[PDB]
Structures are given as C-alpha cells and as structure tokens.
Amino acid sequence: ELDLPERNLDRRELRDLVNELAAHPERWAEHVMFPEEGGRHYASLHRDAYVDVWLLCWRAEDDTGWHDHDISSGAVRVVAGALKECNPRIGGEHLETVVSEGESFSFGPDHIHRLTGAVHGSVSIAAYSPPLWRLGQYSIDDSGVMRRVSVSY
C-alpha cells in the first residue's frame, strides 16, 4: 500500500499526508466507487500499526453521525465536491462548516464531530494516527439523555 513512516503522525503531518495523496491520483483513482445502496463506501488505502488511510466516496444521504476517534488524531482532504463538518455545542446550536474541494482540516484526539451534507459524488481522503481501531458513537434516547457507544472499527 502506501510507503509511510513507521511511527505515529501528528495532526499537521496527517494533513500534509492527505493533501499530498490528493495530488497522487495513482494511489486512489482505481478505488473510487459509489455504492448505490448499502453503507457509506470506504476504501482502505493503508492500514498498519501507525496510520490508517481511507478514500471516501459520498452520497447525498451519507452521515457519519456524531462520533469521536478515541485516541486517534485525524485529517480530511476533500478531493471533489463538498462536505459539511459539524461540531456539537451543548445548547444544541451546533457549529457547521462547509469544506469544499481542495480544502482540508485536521484534529487531535479530543475531537467530536459529524460529517454530512455531502454533494452527491463527493470524494475525500481521510487519515488517522494512531490507527482508527476504536470510535465512540454518540446517541440520544427519547429522554434526551446522551450515551457513547465505543465501536471496534
């Protein structure tokens, strides 16, 4: 797969990584695929003890839900289209940012977010270090009470 360092990458290095990958379509163009039904297409470009890299192809309906990445830092580069990056606020008036093609962002391991509102056919590259082996998925009950499900991923 990818020829990356044998160590964890910090946020900035992860952002450099997804941006340089966007400039090397030889590493990912083959894997571009839009599942007509089923779940969010994801394609692993690289998974080892230190870094995970995925190529994501979005449908208009795709939604990560609210989640954290446990101990993983991460970065996202939008290659084509646009996404909405959302961050939760306790009041309920959550922060929403449009990330469009050519743009990228990164976060450390404390980040809680939701990606949704994609242009149909959008394409993005995501990288995580350490690997995204566990994620916390938040849900709300009828009461309004918030819980966090830790998911092996």
Q: Is 20 annotated as a binding residue?
A: yes
- Minimal CB distance to Mg ion: which residue? 48
Q: Is 13 annotated as a binding residue?
A: no
Q: Is 24 annotated as a binding residue?
A: no
Q: State the binding partner of 48 from Mg ion, a copy of itself, none, CB within 5 to 8 A by kind.
A: Mg ion
Q: Are the beta carbons of 53 and 126 closer than 8 angstroms? A: yes
Q: For a copy of itself, give the closer residue by CB, 27 or 128.
A: 128
Q: State the binding partner of 134 from Mg ion, a copy of itself, none, CB within 5 to 8 A by kind.
A: none
Q: Is 152 annotated as a binding residue?
A: no
Which residues in this chain contact Mg ion in the complex, by CB under 5 A?
48
- Closest approach, Cβ 52 to a copy of itself, in A, equals 19
